[model samples]
Target: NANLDTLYRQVIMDHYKNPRNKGVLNDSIVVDMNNPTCGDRIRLTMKLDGDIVEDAKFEGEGCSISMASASMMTQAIKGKDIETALSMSKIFSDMMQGKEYDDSIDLGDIEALQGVSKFPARIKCATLSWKALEKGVAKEE
Candidate 1:
């Protein structure tokens, strides 16, 4: 578990420094969200094929948590149904709130963000992209 913590930190930094899916999607639904308190801005674009998330991308300016979270979120939600994406968003929200969650689904790199739950101020930083995901998907449906 101690090693896992170190690995998680490495993963977070990796995503922050070299983010995946970090761009805009043409012909995609766009949802922009921001954290006024911290001045973090996110412009998230997603393409939905039916109820499945066909693609996702994000352009953001923020700290490591926010940027890394956006990168991880785009990876997690792609190829998933809207319901699953929203479920993951809810689970993530609950996780950040320091609540227990069912471990049935594999969150992959998203699990690395569990550490952010320890810091209340950083929770929103991590959740910015997820809120964009939820709002974007809701509008799509």
Candidate 2:
């Protein structure tokens, strides 16, 4: 079910066009991750209130998919529990590997990034957010 047209819908393009939740959160747990292979760098910061992700945002430079995926990732995990956010991260990792993932969760605009996996060099960019999330989530463990 890797349909390019369905996954890369207009909304994904819209977010890629104008990303959301893109900025820095002051005095937060900063998790900087990058795809050194492709030079896609992202600095993500999150404020965790107990198990809840209170506020999250990011700033980065990369292709449309990388930037937009980071934008969407910040929005999706903000205010969510660490477990849920981590689950999403795991699923995203699976998806980006072109493996069969649990589709029960709505990926929102993130599905657009599937195309990025098609390009080997771009897969790291697609997973940068997940890498950031892993660091943030693991710190709590």
Candidate 3:
């Protein structure tokens, strides 16, 4: 039997415990943003070398989903090309909107955040990484 009581289940807790990329970067394209209403903010910095996301990390203040999603998002994008990272960001955005999303991609822990779609107000918290990603990749390209 699947237990929903654990609501913020194992995967989420794991990301929170072991945040994938939790720091700063040098020579990074810094994309900073925040949710003023909730005082939730994220400053995501990334270093892209060729196709690979050579490095990635973040600094932020938020609740579990926001923090955990940031952790998972950074993990998924690391070592990935800038293009793929941005593409996955789009898919993640669509999924957060409760729309049909293509699961054929190797999103890893990012998929764990799908549950956040149930809470509309928190959607920005979920998509914070995507926004940062758009800023990073768009300027890079």
Candidate 4:
């Protein structure tokens, strides 16, 4: 269990230090999320191609958990359809609470965030990006 914990910690640290898809897209659906408790905030941008996520990116400042979650999110959502991305958001929400989400989702590096559930306080930190993704999906202008 200690080794597994170390592995998850490494994954989180890797994303925190070297985030993927950390940028903003022009003419895209953008959403901003914040964690008032920790003052962690992120801006997420999505370029949707009909039903597919053409591109996803984010820029923000906060703790390693929140920022790393954003990194994993933008990287995962790219090239995925809107439906798939939405499902992952729900699945990921469940994951943060240690609930039984669909293990079949193949969450890749994002799964490292699952450990944050035990902290309770950090759940809000890890969820900011996914909440931004969900908000961007429902947003219409």
lDDT string, candidate 4, 1-141, tens digits: 999888888999999999999889988998988898899989999998887899998999999999999999899889998889999988999888877756898999988888888899999999899999889988842
In model 2, state the lDDT of residue 57: 89
Q: Report, for every candidate in turn, its global Cα lDDT versus the true structure.
A: 0.90, 0.82, 0.82, 0.90
Query: Where's the lowest-lDDT run of ten residues in candidate 3?
Result: 1-10
Ranking by TM-score: 4, 1, 3, 2
lDDT of 3 by residue, 22-129 (tens): 888998888888877666778899988876899999988877778888898888888888778878888888888978678979777777788878778888888887
C-alpha RMSD (angstroms) for model 1 = 1.6
How do the candidates rank by lDDT, highest first?
1, 4, 3, 2
Task: Pick the TM-score winner.
Answer: 4
**Model 1 C-alpha lDDT per residue in residues 1-141, reported as the tens digit of each score:** 999888889999999999999899988999999999988999999988888899999998999999999999999889999999999899888887878665777888887888988888999999999999988978877
Candidate 3 runs further than 4 Å off: none
Which ranges of candidate 2 are over 4 A from the true structure? 1-12
Alpha-carbon deviation at 83 in model 3, angstroms: 1.5
Count clashing residue pairs in model 3. Answer: 1
Estimate the lDDT of model 1. Answer: 0.90
How much is the lDDT of residue 28 in candidate 1?
94
| Every candidate's CA RMSD | 1.6, 2.9, 1.8, 1.4
